[PDB]
């Protein structure tokens, strides 16, 4: 009966859901930017559609506190599928802890197949007025990789 | 045991059995007929319509509904669960389930905004009205598991 | 001894008593209305007798707060019997709560045997200057059924 | 004109109303289909792909500023989710009182999968019971149940 | 002749062999069909309704008494389970050695759903390894895997 | 934990992972390559073929196989169970499952009659022979969970 | 997981299976007996087919030791379905104990719809060299009903 208890839950608002949408929007936005320009004669506006058909995604998830992380990953998958994506075009990578997220994400982003990457994880403590070194490095690494490879990377971590 | 989802499921089970007995031919006589429904769900098909808004609470309500049906001898294979965006469109979805000949009862679960209204609320009044009219027209029990935040 | 303590009570004035009388009066009134007309020559007056011999009744009662509801049901039965009715011609239906009264009453009113229906129940709260949805629906349902089927339905609920 | 286009309209009641219509339209299309084989509890939910669906919109003209931002919010929700602008029918009515009757005409067409109702309501500066607002909600709810076609409610108070 | 018909043949190896063929024929017809939707572990099993299926039987003539009771056992199993006697093809061969080659010819026809092999084997009164018996089992097993069609084994030792 | 059904499931899981790694490109060098399979069943599809003869024992064997797959992270949704009359026709049914592109491994479960044969048994020798040949031809692992009474 | 543990079991040989087959065979046999005769010229043989399409069945099962009885009932249903029957055409009746089987079976056998009845139950003790009164009465009742109504009734009880 526990299978239906867990399957009867909904995963529509967790941070995994919003992280997936941003990746879908940014991936479509880039296709239009590096395509042909407009006809001019008016201000040109660019914005990404939310159709996720024909796009390839990769997800990197840490293993700490897998009870919560598992629910964030399921939220991300649901968002992609419900917007027209195929579960065939998702790659999932698991890592021991938060310190290892940027290096693993770097491997996936260098493949020609993938169009966007989603990073999911849970940080330690966080609720203290102090500078945390692990938190700062993970944010720094993902930001640098995105700018270097010119490929969007979404940041879906939480604190607890 | 103490949530409105549990209570709503029990009412659906009892009403489904009661209807089954009423269609039977009346007794010979010699006493006052008394009709009532028993609390065994074996061999009955159920449908559930739940809203997603304020999902933190409804999952516990849908939890109770499924648990009650199974605990009282119901087979989990016979539950059909339908999800809708908000409470405004529970009645329209419930009507589609109630018209299936393979469904014995329907349970509606949802949450409504605070009840400190000046005099009236225009969305809450339509959910209850629609479900009540639907039950009488189709002659099939529909239970109201909605709660107010 | 408790059997005589409860049996020694009287049930002559409770709302079950008046609900039964209205059903008796209305049931007899309809027989005269759809019968042959008068001879004219003067204003014609119709009114129902209180003789309950040969009439079939049905009672729908909710189960909430059965301590009070049980006494209302006994009052209704006493009224019918004391006016000449037979306990053989009473059908009793029990329902979980007030929300289920109109649907059950609809089933009984469609039978050709029954001549009137009596609804008994106890409502929740009620003593608040606010619009209650369960109370409104139960009143609405019984009113609509009576007009649609052209069969009297009496309304014997109370508040507590 | 470009100043008008630059404003954002994601998240306004026009956006949510259109999004609900897309989900309900897909949900019904699944229910009418063949049932599952069995062997487990069977769950239904509507996808958010809007390609191939036809929509209708009824909007009042009162308070011409607020309404336009709501109507444009609905249209962009359909387009950004895969819909084509050639499959939208727009109807405009003088006021909120006659939304239900116009919505009925659109809903009876066999080429429409869902209907979206947009409007605004005048709020008197003391809380009495409004006899116009109640009739709009009552009328729209009855139409959906009778016609068995989803209708979404997208009005706001001034 | 009526004395021959009066005897019972339920339960002899002809009966069991035919019954297995019916189940396997239905099982394969299910596997080739569309897969289930999902949501649970998916189980397959063959029904025992024989209407609409075509069968072939290969039987040797050695020990003409024993074989006939086995062949008649197979036929009644098909008929009593709904099959028609017009959908059975019977082939007779001199001896057990040439059952596999004849069974191959029947199995290659597109109008056959299963094949049943019946025969008896001579048991020498001391237990040596039989070079004829092993070849029959080896040949029949290879044919079924290669042709992807069920073949049932219904032989006995004297 | 101690039945052949449990052991057969573990072997199928390990072989399925091992094949997945071998198809990967070889390493740069500078050491001896070592290939091995891990014991995590997540994301793998399995098929089971079981015989009905002597059903008292096989149910315990099929019990272990399903329990092992789930305990090691396998999803029960991915198990396909096929039943056949006797052991003679396990190979033909196993071949139909192995040719599906959605199956990673196949487990065969059955029971054979007493092994006090004079020199040889003609039915037992065909089950093992057929499964072995089938695995090599299709290049897919097939596990042998058969036991002797 | 327990749902698959119980569903993975087989029910092919238990007494419920054989009881169902006898009912299927006898029900078909009677249709041929009371039909048109043969052409003669040879000894005429009657025997029942095992096709269970278009036949209606009824099952009476006691409730003592429901762990075992439940498995016998499932065996009976499987036999009917696997031979071409429809689960729509099965009526199931549950009774408190073995003493009540013959009276319940009598009710079902008098309906014109049903073609055969299957009785399932578990007897008490039994493994004693003594005459048991409950066991004797149940066997006697079923035998008498079958001969009186001219309708087959199958006897699928066991001892434990």
């Amino acid at each position: 009966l526990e299978q239906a208890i867990e399957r009867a839950g909904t995963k529509h608002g967790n941070k995994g859901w919003e992280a997936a949408l941003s990746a879908i929007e940014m991936a479509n936005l880039f296709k239009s930017l590096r395509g042909t320009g407009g006809s001019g004669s008016s201000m040109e506006i660019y914005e990404g559609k939310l159709t996720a058909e024909g796009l390839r995604f990769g997800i990197v998830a840490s293993r700490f506190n897998h009870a919560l992380v598992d629910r964030l990953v399921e939220g991300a998958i649901d968002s992609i599928v419900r917007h027209g994506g195929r579960e065939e075009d998702i790659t999932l990578v698991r890592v021991p802890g938060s310190w290892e997220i940027p290096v693993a994400a770097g491997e996936l982003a260098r493949k020609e197949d993938i169009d966007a990457v989603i990073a999911i994880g849970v940080l330690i403590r966080g609720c203290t007025p102090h500078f945390d070194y692990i938190a700062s490095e993970v944010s720094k690494g993902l930001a640098n990789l995105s700018l270097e490879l010119r490929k969007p990377i979404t940041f879906g971590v939480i604190t607890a």
Side-chain angles (χ1 to χ4, degrees), chain A:
Chain A
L1 183 68
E2 294 293 328
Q3 63 84 30
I5 296 169
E6 65 183 1
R7 190 174 52 152
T10 187
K11 293 182 183 293
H12 166 279
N14 49 17
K15 299 298 293 295
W17 178 273
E18 293 83 3
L21 294 174
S22 310
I24 297 169
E25 178 167 320
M26 294 300 286
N28 278 310
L29 162 58
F30 269 30
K31 274 182 205 339
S32 66
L33 266 171
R34 67 184 68 188
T36 187
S39 66
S41 66
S42 66
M43 182 179 72
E44 186 177 3
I45 300 192
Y46 291 86
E47 184 178 1
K49 292 187 152 38
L50 300 165
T51 61
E53 198 198 31
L55 282 71
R56 283 82 58 85
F57 298 111
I59 300 171
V60 191
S62 66
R63 271 222 304 288
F64 182 76
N65 182 341
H66 63 87
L68 193 46
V69 168
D70 278 308
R71 291 209 316 261
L72 282 71
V73 179
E74 294 293 328
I77 297 169
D78 280 1
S79 180
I80 297 169
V81 176
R82 284 193 56 191
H83 280 69
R86 304 178 26 221
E87 184 178 1
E88 295 294 328
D89 305 1
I90 296 173
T91 301
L92 180 52
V93 170
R94 304 212 188 244
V95 296
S98 63
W99 175 265
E100 296 86 32
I101 283 176
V103 58
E107 294 293 328
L108 266 184
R110 293 181 184 271
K111 293 182 183 293
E112 295 293 328
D113 292 331
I114 297 169
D115 293 324
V117 187
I118 306 146
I120 297 169
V122 163
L123 301 188
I124 301 299
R125 288 170 187 278
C127 320
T128 187
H130 301 80
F131 185 89
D132 174 26
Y133 300 116
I134 297 89
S136 179
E137 287 313 325
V138 166
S139 308
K140 182 175 174 66
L142 297 188
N144 279 2
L145 270 177
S146 179
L147 268 161
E148 159 172 49
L149 302 150
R150 298 161 65 161
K151 186 180 289 293
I153 296 187
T154 300
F155 186 52
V157 298
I158 66 187
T159 70

